[PDB]
Write a protein that binds this ligand. Sequence first.
Ligand SMILES: [Cl-]
Ligand SMILES: [Cl-]
Ligand SMILES: [Cl-]
Ligand SMILES: [Cu+2]
Ligand SMILES: [Cu+2]
Ligand SMILES: [Cu+2]
Ligand SMILES: [Cu+2]
Ligand SMILES: [Cu+2]
Ligand SMILES: [Cu+2]
Ligand SMILES: [Er+3]
Ligand SMILES: [Er+3]
Ligand SMILES: [Er+3]
Ligand SMILES: [Er+3]
Ligand SMILES: [Er+3]
Ligand SMILES: [Er+3]
Ligand SMILES: [Er+3]
Ligand SMILES: [Er+3]
Ligand SMILES: [Er+3]
Ligand SMILES: [Er+3]
Ligand SMILES: [Er+3]
Ligand SMILES: [Er+3]
Ligand SMILES: [Tb+3]
Ligand SMILES: [Tb+3]
Ligand SMILES: [Tb+3]
Ligand SMILES: [Y+3]
Ligand SMILES: [Y+3]
Ligand SMILES: [Y+3]
Ligand SMILES: [Y+3]
Ligand SMILES: [Y+3]
Ligand SMILES: [Y+3]
Ligand SMILES: [Yb+3]
Ligand SMILES: [Yb+3]
Ligand SMILES: [Yb+3]
Ligand SMILES: [Yb+3]
Ligand SMILES: [Yb+3]
Ligand SMILES: [Yb+3]
Ligand SMILES: [Yb+3]
Ligand SMILES: [Yb+3]
Ligand SMILES: [Yb+3]
Lengths: 299, 299, 299
Amino acid sequence: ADISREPDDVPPPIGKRAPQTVRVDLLSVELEGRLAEGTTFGYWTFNGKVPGPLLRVRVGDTVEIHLKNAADSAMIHSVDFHAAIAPGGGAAALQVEPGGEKAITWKALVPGLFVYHCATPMVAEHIANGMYGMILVEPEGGLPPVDHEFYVMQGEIYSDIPYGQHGSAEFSVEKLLAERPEYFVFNGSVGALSKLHPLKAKVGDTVRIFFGVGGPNHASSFHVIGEIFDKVDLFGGLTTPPLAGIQTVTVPPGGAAIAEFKVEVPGTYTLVDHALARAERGLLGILHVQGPENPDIYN
Amino acid sequence: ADISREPDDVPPPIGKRAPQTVRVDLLSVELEGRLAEGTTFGYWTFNGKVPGPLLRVRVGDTVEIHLKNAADSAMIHSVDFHAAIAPGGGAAALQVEPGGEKAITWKALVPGLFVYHCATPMVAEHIANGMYGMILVEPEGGLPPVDHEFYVMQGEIYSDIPYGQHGSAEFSVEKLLAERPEYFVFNGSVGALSKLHPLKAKVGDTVRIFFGVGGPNHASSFHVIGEIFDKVDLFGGLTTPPLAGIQTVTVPPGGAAIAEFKVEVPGTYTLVDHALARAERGLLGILHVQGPENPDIYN
Amino acid sequence: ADISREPDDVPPPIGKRAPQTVRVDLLSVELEGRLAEGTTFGYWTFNGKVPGPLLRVRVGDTVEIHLKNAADSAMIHSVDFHAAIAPGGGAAALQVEPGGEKAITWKALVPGLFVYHCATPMVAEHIANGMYGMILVEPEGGLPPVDHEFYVMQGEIYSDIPYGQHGSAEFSVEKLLAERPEYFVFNGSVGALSKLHPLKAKVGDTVRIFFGVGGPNHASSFHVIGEIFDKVDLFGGLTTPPLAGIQTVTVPPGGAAIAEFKVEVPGTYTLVDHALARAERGLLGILHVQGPENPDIYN
Ligand SMILES: [Cl-]
Ligand SMILES: [Cl-]
Ligand SMILES: [Cl-]
Ligand SMILES: [Cu+2]
Ligand SMILES: [Cu+2]
Ligand SMILES: [Cu+2]
Ligand SMILES: [Cu+2]
Ligand SMILES: [Cu+2]
Ligand SMILES: [Cu+2]
Ligand SMILES: [Er+3]
Ligand SMILES: [Er+3]
Ligand SMILES: [Er+3]
Ligand SMILES: [Er+3]
Ligand SMILES: [Er+3]
Ligand SMILES: [Er+3]
Ligand SMILES: [Er+3]
Ligand SMILES: [Er+3]
Ligand SMILES: [Er+3]
Ligand SMILES: [Er+3]
Ligand SMILES: [Er+3]
Ligand SMILES: [Er+3]
Ligand SMILES: [Tb+3]
Ligand SMILES: [Tb+3]
Ligand SMILES: [Tb+3]
Ligand SMILES: [Y+3]
Ligand SMILES: [Y+3]
Ligand SMILES: [Y+3]
Ligand SMILES: [Y+3]
Ligand SMILES: [Y+3]
Ligand SMILES: [Y+3]
Ligand SMILES: [Yb+3]
Ligand SMILES: [Yb+3]
Ligand SMILES: [Yb+3]
Ligand SMILES: [Yb+3]
Ligand SMILES: [Yb+3]
Ligand SMILES: [Yb+3]
Ligand SMILES: [Yb+3]
Ligand SMILES: [Yb+3]
Ligand SMILES: [Yb+3]
């Protein structure tokens, strides 16, 4: 029923541990999920949620990825890692028929936040139906610790029925090619980070949002309303020193961003793409901040 | 009649002065203005012009913002500062009914050029109707002086009547959600920086353009035709050292850019978004450069 | 017949030579070319191919540009250099009637990869019909050598007939203003870097792609499927140190990017804009990598 992935669904950080072999088990499932209130959609998912599970490795880690396809699936599924140096991002040999299972190993060489998605023809459809996720490759030593870590991805829903219409919705190839989505969604559904799973922090907390755009067509202008990003890893790269003091960051489709900020004032904060007509199409996130008032910063 | 804000309408720079309390008085006015020749539009404005007044403060400055709403206004108006660490950017407690007045104080902590806009439902409409501006927070010491400073913002007009049709134009909610504007405008109207207020500099002048995108939907690829930007503050951040020698800079909606360049050759220079079909929809700016010819640079 | 420019069509690199006068001869030709299989289009070209010839100079080089227009041409043609400090990028005095010839000289002052295009009204049409190219201004000393250098540009085709329809296609002004292209193309045509001229490298080679977007409307999210960019010159600037370890890079219309990467694993690699619905409209590139398998990186 609930396809929305929780933002707080984040693996524990890698410490100062040495490189190792890491096993990953991803299962591609097609299920009917809640897109909006009264509206259901035919989702293609990794592990039954949109986006797919956030993965967390170190540089030098050999990732042993297993991809199983559910028996009741109607489509061939794969996975393309942006962290991988492999033909098709390793999806060349991960074309899995419903029922079967394939496995490859790849080594992470570049630190940063990378997008993963299904790379089965047609790729734009598989992504749009919700088959996208992120893989974080932490550098040697790891990221400096913060109080809160969140996992947010932007996606497009190309439903045949118009926005506002209740009932069963299927993918529209016409809208896809026209690049005209009916719904813009954070983490799968409408109000996934609003009514369903609102982000929560306390006054004085440093928040790190692992943001990425599944797409598959439109770029995002990521902005937390009421906050300025202290540090931004542009395109989600953890090699070049980050940008400092940014209001809005351009995140391309298949791209990432590591946005860090300190919360100083209590209240409600809004996660939006600053193409704010999309906020009327479900692209709205809520960050509740509880604590004492800070009159020196805001009165 | 003339809603277009002049590019040369810039406050005098902050010197090396210490942090202080700065009062700001913004008045939200709805008035009929010239969108194009023969075409008028229902504008929602800050201080009667699009974009709103450019504000200029220092880091550590406590900004005392007063927002008055005109008695003849038909809408609730607010203001969201990207420079502010406050719920809704301070717009949570600046929802002003026509006739009333509210006031808050916030402290500027991050240097850079920040967008401000009305944040009253629906936000995309309020922005589109012309309620956007910029606030420059100068760092400790201030910006190095230049010969000319300009203030340019990009906006979209979602008129019900098609482009080319004369008469009274109103906002179209259908076009807004479709992200299909009839007009792309610099500083409010068509030919605002062309026929109305052309930019003017002399040979050898260093020019600084405080560029920002009101939007509310489309990003800009800022380019001055015939010039290369010497220094660009990406996303309008004045913390990280600027980029050097850039032709075209991606500016997202609700984002900024500080573009600096030296003018070496006399003639006409064109301010455009490099999505140059928009130049046929009013998104065109003129920079007249007068002086002697420089054959070593261009013959 | 074949309008597609080969990616391997790159001038030999500038060594450590001193600044000099460089002559450039560009001829604007209008010819019927293969857009897709069974589909032909009315192309406006520089030197008979899309994109135009890649030019290669040093900083301090005085570029003597000659622009000849073919006698059988039906349009006025010009050329706007982003590397030039000149009114209209030097296109102000390079408006050449079919049959005539004009010449100007300009000095390159800024290092980086710059876009060039025709700047004759209406500019968006001239670009869309294929009149765009790149000029690389190498810094003092030059770029570090790589094994392979490629030349790739993204363009839009606004055909009157829909995608899939065979026959003669002409430019549609309606689609242009609507920003709705039927075809997205790398280097002129559909399958230009796929079926026609596939990129080829060997295992262990460092590859440098001089990527740029002719446009004239849509931005690109450049991504090589199966590879991570080691170094990216953002907006194609060779002054500021490059970004490191990037998956997907936002390249604006009229903008550039110098993407470098090391190929470690044999197989097929895909050049795409990560707006992957465009990959169904011809925006697809192939990089064949031949050599021994590397099980440590990918198995
Ligand atoms: Cl899971
Ligand atoms: Cl004023
Ligand atoms: Cl040639
Ligand atoms: Cu799939
Ligand atoms: Cu991808
Ligand atoms: Cu308002
Ligand atoms: Cu905003
Ligand atoms: Cu031309
Ligand atoms: Cu240009
Ligand atoms: Er494990
Ligand atoms: Er479906
Ligand atoms: Er604590
Ligand atoms: Er106190
Ligand atoms: Er004051
Ligand atoms: Er109106
Ligand atoms: Er002087
Ligand atoms: Er002389
Ligand atoms: Er020569
Ligand atoms: Er034609
Ligand atoms: Er060798
Ligand atoms: Er071995
Ligand atoms: Tb704490
Ligand atoms: Tb002077
Ligand atoms: Tb070699
Ligand atoms: Y977990
Ligand atoms: Y603590
Ligand atoms: Y003033
Ligand atoms: Y002076
Ligand atoms: Y050659
Ligand atoms: Y060698
Ligand atoms: Yb993991
Ligand atoms: Yb099958
Ligand atoms: Yb609140
Ligand atoms: Yb001020
Ligand atoms: Yb009311
Ligand atoms: Yb001129
Ligand atoms: Yb050359
Ligand atoms: Yb003529
Ligand atoms: Yb292969």
